[PDB]
From a paper:
The capsular polysaccharides (CPSs) surrounding the A. baumannii cells are the primary receptors for bacteriophages encoding specific structural depolymerases that determine the initial step of phage–host interaction. The genomes of Friunaviruses encode only one tailspike depolymerase (TSD) specific to a certain K type or several K types with similar structures or linkages between K units. In the obtained trimeric structures of the TSDs APK09_gp48, APK14_gp49, and APK16_gp47, each chain contains a particle-binding N-terminal domain and a central β-helix domain, as well as a C-terminal domain forming CPS-recognizing/degrading parts. All depolymerases studied were specific glycosidases that cleaved the corresponding CPSs by the hydrolytic mechanism with the production of monomers or/and oligomers (dimers and trimers) of the repeating K units.
APK14_gp49 structure consists of an N-terminal domain (residues 153–277) that possesses two α-helices (167–173 and 261–274) as well as four stranded β-sheet (176–241), a central β-helix domain (278–730) having 14 rungs and a C-terminal six-stranded β-barrel domain (731–851). Rungs 6–12 of the central β-helix domain are rungs, where B1, B3, and T3 are solvent-exposed, and T2 faces the three-fold symmetry axis of the trimer. Rungs 1–5 have only two β-strands, B2 and B3, and rungs 13–14 lack B2 and possess only B1 and B3. The APK14_gp49 β-helix domain is stabilized by 10 salt bridges, 79 hydrogen bonds, and hydrophobic interactions in a manner similar to those of APK16_gp47. APK14_gp49 crystallographic trimer has a diameter of 75Å and a length of about 150Å. Each subunit of the trimer has an interface area of about 2948Å2 (11% of the total subunit area). The trimer is dominantly stabilized by polar interactions, including a total of 105 hydrogen bonds and 15 salt bridges, while the hydrophobic impact is relatively small. The trimer has two non-interacting cavities in the central β-helix domain and one cavity in the N-terminal domain. In contrast to TSD APK16_gp47, in the APK14_gp49 trimer, the central cavities contain solvent molecules. Cleavage of the A. baumannii AB5256 CPS with depolymerase APK14_gp49 resulted in monomer 3 and dimer 4 of the K unit.
Author numbering:
A (entry chain A), B (entry chain A): 153 to 567
The structure:
Amino acid sequence: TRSADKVIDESGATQQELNNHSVQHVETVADLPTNAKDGAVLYVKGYYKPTNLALAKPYKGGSTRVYVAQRKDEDDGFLCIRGWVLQSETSIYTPHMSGCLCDGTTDDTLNFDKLMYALEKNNIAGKVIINDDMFFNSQCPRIGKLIDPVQFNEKNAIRLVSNVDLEINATLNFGPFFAGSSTQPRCNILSAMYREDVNDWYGKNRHENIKVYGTGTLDFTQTESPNAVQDGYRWIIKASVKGMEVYGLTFKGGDFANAIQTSKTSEHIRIYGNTFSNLMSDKSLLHDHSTIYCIGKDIKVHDNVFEFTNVKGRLNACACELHGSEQWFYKNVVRGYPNLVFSAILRTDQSLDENEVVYDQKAFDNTAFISRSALGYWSLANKSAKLRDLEFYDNTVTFIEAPTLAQYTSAGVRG
Amino acid sequence: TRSADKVIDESGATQQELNNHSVQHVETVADLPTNAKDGAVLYVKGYYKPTNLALAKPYKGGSTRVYVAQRKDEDDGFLCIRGWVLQSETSIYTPHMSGCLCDGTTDDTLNFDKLMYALEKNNIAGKVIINDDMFFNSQCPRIGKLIDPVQFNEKNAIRLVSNVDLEINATLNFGPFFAGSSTQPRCNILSAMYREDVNDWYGKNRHENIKVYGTGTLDFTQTESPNAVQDGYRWIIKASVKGMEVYGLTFKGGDFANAIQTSKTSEHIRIYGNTFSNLMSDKSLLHDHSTIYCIGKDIKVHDNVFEFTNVKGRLNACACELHGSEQWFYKNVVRGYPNLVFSAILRTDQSLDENEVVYDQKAFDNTAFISRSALGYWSLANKSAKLRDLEFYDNTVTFIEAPTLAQYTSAGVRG
Ligand SMILES: [Cl-]
């Protein structure tokens, strides 16, 4: 029974010196050993044990990790597990790598926030790719930029992060947790809204370079509730941002006042190639929906499909509200909405200052099959905000009949 | 003290046979050993030692490498370090992997060119992702397609490469090296301009499939100088290219005659989703700026933000010059420029041949807040080039007052 120190290699090195320099493996993060040499390397085959060794990708959320003895007590379940530090040169991550199951039915809210909060907390630029279906059904931890010092009590599933691409190529299912109620009426499902103190209602510390995109689907069917009441604070994405892009995605079901709303000081938003389908249910008590609610400057909303096939959205809904300057709505299709576009000049603290003059609102090359209004102009009465110019050109509009009182009653419309 | 050859495995193989087949690790490229078995594999944890083991990504520019004994003297500091050959199946690279620090203050010009020149020299198609801030402050080596046989003496920071995506998701800072002077007035910061001999002024050997994109920023503030003089040869990107795309990026500060100029025989350029901000300083001796200078055919300039908030660019600047055929300028916003678009029909060796007829110049759906000209038509006097057609349609133009003589003097405008 001789020492590894006593065995010698055709290089002249101890088996012991070689063993200290060997890339080794363990099955799962649970198997990360607690007394390894500082600087040890492990390939971890999967986050958890394989659920089924017969299927094509048995091992999920595998990682290469280096042990950093001085961080051995840090366990974020992602970048550093009991000092084993995740190696990812290109900063491209998946939810499996933070212990998400991605089985479409396990609530992955907590384990997904271990990924997103890690990238937030460490100012990491990168990409999160979602290739497998997920379920969200609980509150995303209110830490870091998801603290709620104003106490709006918006339900959140996902922490958006500055300089992170969220690439959604599978179905995200949102569950009944996120249904509205009289007691907690508000929601912001994928939050890009940082409020630093009790006074910071509109997110003065803007996020930067938010990208939400991909070929997947965000399904809010399971959030639909007769209990949900009208509140302006019901969003798929509420952002305070400089530089945001939301593209490619299908959004369907739920009870939202808006799919996407920006904030007072927001700039450079691009919303394109998406499908917005039935974002306000028949049977809730909501009674108003505007799919996109454009606050701030340089916002372009284009090449999107807006559709209501239910009754209630065919009786009161608008595809886009233009609340500020340099806001264009172009090359969209709008199916069944009463209202195509609103120019809304509201002299109110969430948007326009006293004496503010709004310029460069454009709406062009849209198709609309609508029953009520192609262009709506709103303001408060007797206030100091003014519109310089709005151009509404080259739109192809067909006015169609709204659903009947019989269809309203057959569909159980409430609200 | 027994031979590894004498120790035997539950497989019946020598510890020596196993040791020859073990993936091993070293800390840094400096640690790459000089007498390993041909075919040995090392995981190199980082390019350099970690700067700080407490932070989230302690190890940067880690690599897997195979020793190729026959290349043991080749050291490009990237694909082959003393015969250790970099393994990267998808050809996705980062500047850390060539020994860039990416700390935003160390001059990474040389180490970044070790990456770009390697991909050039070996005709490698792939992607370079930049997720961390960099600084450039010296001349990019004049080798390969950056040789200067015409002796224009353009200062260059970055070698663009055919069939390489440059993905910039952080801030690139350009330093005072790149400031103009009377002695070396010319620059081409990210060069896609190959000139093969002393006679090849306009890049006859076009690059192919240049992509420059991302969510980041190119900051030329530190290049701004009272010493910089007007020269046409002052560019962020001067390309001779077939197939180029520049998208998503913010460009700000500096003293450029153009942000982007193409060449006589260039084709299929797409310039979109960018922000061009203050690309000519108040205090330099430059007196003319056109953001985009379109030479060749099939060039589309769209969905960009052009802005001068300084004085000098609010007194002489144009967003786009159309110098050739199939050139469209559309869906842009232009803030503060005197001039929106120029149709420039110059019968000159850098562009139009004798008797050349320019066709299909279009400018549509733009917003402009400008003080001098919506559409400018230029030519040389008494020459043989002609314009067939220019269409300028569906633009929304507001003529605003230029800055005052007081604002000019308060801003120290020179030039
Ligand atoms: Cl049109």
